[PDB]
Each structure stands twice: as structure tokens, then as C-alpha cells.
Design an enzyme around this catalytic site. Structure first.
Site, PDB file in Angstrom:
ATOM      1  CD  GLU A  67      -3.354  13.632  23.114  1.00  0.00           C
ATOM      2  OE1 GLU A  67      -3.277  14.539  22.259  1.00  0.00           O
ATOM      3  OE2 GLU A  67      -4.379  12.914  23.135  1.00  0.00           O
ATOM      4  CD  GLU A  69      -7.093  11.848  22.105  1.00  0.00           C
ATOM      5  OE1 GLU A  69      -6.914  12.758  22.957  1.00  0.00           O
ATOM      6  OE2 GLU A  69      -8.171  11.702  21.464  1.00  0.00           O
ATOM      7  CE  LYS A 213     -10.409  21.333  22.162  1.00  0.00           C
ATOM      8  NZ  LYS A 213     -10.303  20.567  23.443  1.00  0.00           N
TER       9      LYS A 213
END
Lengths: 288, 288
Positions: A67, A69, A213
């Protein structure tokens, strides 16, 4: 390249990434350069080198768990609570031992940026370019001993989405003195837990940490990017996080083609940074 | 704008310079951004702002005497003889009280870069783009009291070329940690002396300083740029200087059109920096 992995301190080849050729545009009014090329700026070349080195240092079988980001927030040094203040005045890779960034942006800014991005997604000329995905998940971290396993649960149907071990491989800190936030670029691994069952083993015991979240994601397939705007309650401390994530697939395909044809790898990076910059600049203009 | 001049600390409008629109190129493979623009990088926006502020602070009648140049050498701080070493790792505007750059590049590098530029000028596909001008001049500085007047004499025909008062208006220092040299961008004024005759008044007295310059200039009209490679004997200390200078005319016409059409001003700046970067990078690759 594809079938090997070498440590960063031992890598010897750096692929040449060529500059954008003067595009086939209406004969411009000014040549872009005396070579008729547009050299990459220094921060995009740095990021291009860093991303290539760091991928090339991870084991080929681990690479589809990458990932990549970009997260917004402020760089703080080891000694002082305040935002770093090196003697520079334009954006650059920031390299100070123990400097750190915790992703978090002012609540008011976060709500005006969400409206901006929602407005950009609904303009009729770009509506088939974005898709919006809203989600609410609870991530709970368990220690096995000692490894930390993250299990993700969707709020509606409490079905465990992801069950993984997250490993931090590297991070770059971009000091952005014209902006109200800096950016951290991170390359993590999200490794799926093996034979350990999720629901059976850890419904019983207590996580060492829980994050809720609430997230709206804007997926822009034509730039291989996702923008994720999230309100997180960290059990409870609230943060407001803004992240841009590149599509792994596209990243791994570009990286696999770097000897053959550098241009796909180089404009994936260029766009990621260009998207980053739009968000950064919009957050700074909203801060006035 | 055109007919006024305001001090830097009192300027309130900054012209908006828009990002390059996704050019009319073969439908690319990746959008450059989710807005379909290519935002300017941070150092080019800084330079665009600085150059506009500094021109806008000089009196309109003085503006055609503007020289905008980029010179290579190393940034040194006030306390230490060595190249500055802020905690950054990509190029940026460097703002430390008393930091200075003296234009000067290793003699061996200067001769390999001269060959490179001569080679680039003779490739048959770019030969009608460059013109080469070789010159040898003696510049002598006289104090009037106290003002410093520079008279320039061509070596062959000892005719005084230029007779001027040079005034330093501003300078930016670009810290380039991936490169073996940094760059200073300067905006000076070369104001022609008025009614004081050159040959009559100062053939008699002794200059306070004399510089001999042996120079080869490469003029690239299509990018509005000149590259000047010079060996200077500073009476005697020798320096080797490499400078890139933008064409004043074109700069003043772009700046006059900034409200009307920002795009000419913005890609003049972009190219100047792109030319700068090619030279910087070639000097760094020759240093290995």
C-alpha cells in the site's frame, strides 16, 4: 527486478526515467527546454527513486500486498512540539532523525474539503470519472505474543472484512512550507494472516487498541488514485484524516515494465504527486 | 502593473497563474490529475511569484535594464567555510540569513560541459536553434566618490562596449542537494550611465577592480535563453562561471501580459528553470 529483491544499501542499477518529450501539442510558443524535453522536477525524481528502491527491496511474493499512500498532517521534530522550520521555503523531502508526522487535519478544513471533493465529483463533465464509496469500519489490533494483528469489521453487517499484519516498510516526509499541512508518503505491507482463523480465535479476547473509521472514498480510475476522507475515533481521541492512495495493481505493473518502458512508471508517479498537490493547495487556500 | 511599481512588502494582488491544461496529446494512458491539469511544482510557483514581485517593485522606466540570470556555485553559510547542509534532500529555495553563493565551478567540469554544449549545438537537427558568440572583454569598476561604474572593453578593438551602474535588486538561492552545485537566481539592473562620458573621463584614472572574461555564449532563441560559459581572471584569481540568462524583452512582454494571459509568463519561467535543471544535472553527472 521482477523476480529478485535487493536491500536498499546494496542496489546498484537505477533505471533511467526519461523526461517527458515535448508533447505533440499545437506547436507551442516557447520550447520547453533547449533539448526539447521537460526534465522532471527534483521532488518527483526523488519520489520516483525512492519508490523504486523500496519496492525492489521487498520480496517479489510480498509485493501485491503493498500500500502506497500519502497522508496529510504536520511534521514535528524530536525536540519541540511545533511544526519543523528548516531554512527552506518550497516543498522538499525532509530528512531529520526522529521527525514524525501524525495524520490529522483541522475539523473545519476537513468538512470544507469534503464538500469541495463532492462538488468536483458531481460536475457533469467529470461524473463518470469518480465513484464514491461510503464506509464505517472498526479496526481492532490484537497482539499474538509479538506480532500485532489488525482485524477490520464493517459496521452494518459485522462481518470481518480484512484480517492482516500491517508492516511499515518506509516513509518519506515532504516538508511543505507554503502549505498549512505537510505530507507523509508511506509504503506499507498489508499481509493477510495465514491459517489463524479470524472470528474463532479473537472474538474472545480484548484488542489492545480499537479505531472506528467513518470514511468516504473517491476513486478516480483514470489517474489510478483514490482519495480517502475519514473521521477516526481512536480508543477516545478523534482525528480527521485525508489520504491519497495509488492503485497497487497499476503500481506493480508499472514497476515490472521499468526496463522495457519507463514512461508508465514515471507518469504514474507524476500523477500521484499532482493529485497530492491539488489536495494540499486546496487545504491551504481553505485555511484563509 | 505596467505603469506602477509597488514595494514587495506592500503588494496585495498576486496574479493567478493556471496550471498547464492536459495538452492535446494523443489521449494519454493516465490522466495527469483528477482535475485534468498539471499543477506547477512548488519551486516553479515560488520562482514565478518571486520574479513577479521583484519586477513589480522596480520603477517601470527601469524595467528594460533588468537582467535575470541563474549562476552555478555552492551555497555557504555565514558560519562555516563549507556548503550548507540543511536537513532536506531535494531542491528548494534556501533562506538562511547571510548565506551566499560565489559563482564558480571546477575547471575540469567546465571544460567537459563546454564540449557537451558545443556538441548539443552541432547536432544537425538542432543546428538552426543555437548561435554561438565568442568574446573577450575587460570589465573595470570605477568609484565616482559613492557609486561604482563598470566600463566594459572588447579586447580586439578596445572600444568600450557597455558603460553602466550595476544594481543588485534581489537574489534567490536554490539549495540542490542531489547536485554538485547549487544555483543563485539574480535580478539585477544594468543602468546606462547618463551624461558622464566613458572614454574621456576614466581612461585617466585607475579602476578599483578589473575582471578579464573569456566567454562563449550559446543563444537559444526558441527557449528565450542564453547559456554563457566564461573563464574570468579577477584582478589574479581565476573563476570558471556558468550562467543562464533569460531574454529581457520576452520577460517584460510576458510580465506586461500577466493579467490578460498568464500562460506566456508561466511557461517562460518553466522553461528557464527546465534549462537550468538540464545544466545542473549535466554538471552533476560529469562529476563521477
Amino acid at each position: 527486478h521482477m523476480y529478485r529483491n535487493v536491500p536498499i544499501w546494496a542496489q546498484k542499477w537505477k533505471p533511467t526515467i526519461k523526461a517527458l518529450q515535448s508533447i505533440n501539442v499545437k506547436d507551442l510558443k516557447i520550447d520547453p527546454s533547449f533539448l526539447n524535453i521537460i526534465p522532471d522536477d527534483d521532488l518527483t525524481k526523488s519520489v520516483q527513486d525512492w519508490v523504486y528502491a523500496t519496492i525492489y527491496s521487498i520480496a517479489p511474493e510480498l509485493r501485491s500486498f503493498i500500500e502506497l499512500e500519502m497522508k496529510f498532517g504536520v511534521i514535528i521534530d524530536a525536540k519541540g512540539p511545533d511544526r519543523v522550520n528548516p531554512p527552506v521555503s518550497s516543498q522538499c523531502v525532509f530528512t531529520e532523525l526522529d521527525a514524525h508526522l501524525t495524520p490529522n487535519i483541522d475539523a473545519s478544513l476537513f468538512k470544507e474539503l469534503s464538500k469541495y471533493i463532492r462538488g468536483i465529483s458531481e460536475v457533469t463533465e467529470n461524473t463518470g470519472k469518480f465513484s464514491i464509496i461510503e464506509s464505517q469500519t472498526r479496526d481492532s489490533v490484537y497482539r499474538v505474543g509479538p506480532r500485532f494483528l489488525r482485524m477490520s469489521t464493517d459496521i452494518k453487517t459485522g462481518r470481518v472484512g480484512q484480517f492482516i499484519e500491517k508492516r511499515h516498510v518506509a516513509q518519506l516526509l515532504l516538508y511543505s512550507p507554503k502549505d498549512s499541512y505537510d505530507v507523509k508518503i508511506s509504503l506499507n505491507l498489508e499481509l493477510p494472516v495465514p491459517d489463524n482463523d479470524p472470528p474463532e480465535k479473537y472474538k474472545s479476547q480484548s484488542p489492545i487498541s480499537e479505531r472506528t473509521k467513518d470514511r468516504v472514498s473517491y476513486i478516480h480510475n483514470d489517474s489510478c488514485t483514490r482519495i480517502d476522507i475519514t473521521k477516526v475515533e481512536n480508543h477516545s481521541e478523534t482525528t480527521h484524516e485525508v489520504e491519497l492512495e495509488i492503485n497497487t495493481p497499476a503500481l506493480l505493473n508499472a514497476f515490472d515494465n521499468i526496463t522495457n518502458d519507463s514512461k508508465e512508471y514515471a507518469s504514474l508517479i507524476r500523477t500521484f504527486l499532482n493529485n497530492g498537490t491539488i489536495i494540499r493547495r486546496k487545504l491551504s487556500s481553505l485555511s484563509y
